[PDB]
Design a protein around this ligand. Sequence first.
Ligand SMILES: Nc1ncnc2c1ncn2[C@@H]1O[C@H](COP(=O)(O)O)[C@@H](O)[C@H]1O
Ligand SMILES: [Ca+2]
Ligand SMILES: [Ca+2]
Ligand SMILES: [Ca+2]
Ligand SMILES: [Ca+2]
Length: 449
Amino acid sequence: LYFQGTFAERYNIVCMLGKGSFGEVLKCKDRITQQEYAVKVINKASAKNKDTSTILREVELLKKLDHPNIMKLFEILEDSSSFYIVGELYTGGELFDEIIKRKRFSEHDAARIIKQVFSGITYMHKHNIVHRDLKPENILLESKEKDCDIKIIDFGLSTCFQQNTDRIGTAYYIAPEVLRGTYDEKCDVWSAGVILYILLSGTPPFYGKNEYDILKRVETGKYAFDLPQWRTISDDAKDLIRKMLTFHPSLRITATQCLEHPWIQKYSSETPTISDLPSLESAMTNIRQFQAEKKLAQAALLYMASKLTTLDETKQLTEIFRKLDTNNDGMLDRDELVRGYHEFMRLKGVDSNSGSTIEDQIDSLMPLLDMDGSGSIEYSEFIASAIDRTILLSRERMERAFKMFDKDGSGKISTKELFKLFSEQVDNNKDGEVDFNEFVEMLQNFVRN
Ligand SMILES: Nc1ncnc2c1ncn2[C@@H]1O[C@H](COP(=O)(O)O)[C@@H](O)[C@H]1O
Ligand SMILES: [Ca+2]
Ligand SMILES: [Ca+2]
Ligand SMILES: [Ca+2]
Ligand SMILES: [Ca+2]
């Protein structure tokens, strides 16, 4: 083990992606799976503001954020000079560029975008994380596909790490209380309100040639819907923006109230159709298999689906997820699954009335699906249960899972090493240990008899 690094053994750096406030962002590649990732490299000695143990606990909470509109982080690794924070790679660029290209969005297009910002921010705030610098440059498009999900990036590190030490246009998005040294949940709502005002109008609500004049406007909180293009935008969109850019933060609406505003609901009516039946049929086949398997099987599968799947693999399940997610909060609750299953039947021409109802089924399934006990089925739990087991069983994926657990790098998993993954066994050669070939059988057996 002496000549193996944690980061360098698993990943090869491909090139630089960019550099913002904390550390620096590169593209890296898993040396076994060949899957590509975004890694933020932070220099320990320059940048650390807390002991390592503090930092690992805070970053661990960031890895646990599982929401379709929040950047996905897979791990934090270290060497003697750096922390490496490895995340999912997004290729669609900043929402900012999409503003430049489009200039302005219709009410429908703006609602579909801002609703995801609301969703992601609601979830952050429920997990007691404030963004602090929400703006279009810190939201990425998952890909170049049309209507792909947005991803909120660049948050969560400001107490663990010191900044690098001339961002242009950042003054547009600041709430007035930020000028008084305050950052809190309500500052994110204000920033989201400035984003919306720009999506609808093409123009900042507190505007000016340079940072001085802009900051002057922000500070009074004075803005208008005076630009000609506003005459044609609905009162409902204006009502929402007014609630978000309310001067006094205690009067300003919460992110959940943003998510639930009637203007959002008016443009988020996405719902399963006939064209989704193939996706829905497949998802359901696989979810029954999952319910059937040992808690141990279910456990290993969640781990593998959440660490090793890719965007391309999950995009159709992503779409089904989104259509079942009725209230747009980025997770599936019990009623949503019951309605979803009733809607699947209706679409298929099958009468729900036909030994065990839809509601009993869902009720017995929630505890198995909701593996962290959250009260909801988050993104990754749905993917684990709804994806083709097959897909996860590629040889390279098993090898990477095997290496995640072989802590000592002996070539064989011990009992203690193995619990990690799930947190009796069958050994063919009976050394009391699992070399890879047995581990493949073990995982392959989970899907099988
Ligand atoms: N997950 C990601 N995928 C692609 N590019 C990223 C990712 N995270 C950050 N970047 C780029 O890296 C730069 C610095 O990111 P940050 O310091 O987090 O704002 C910006 O260009 C980002 O668009
Ligand atoms: Ca929901
Ligand atoms: Ca859950
Ligand atoms: Ca071992
Ligand atoms: Ca063995």
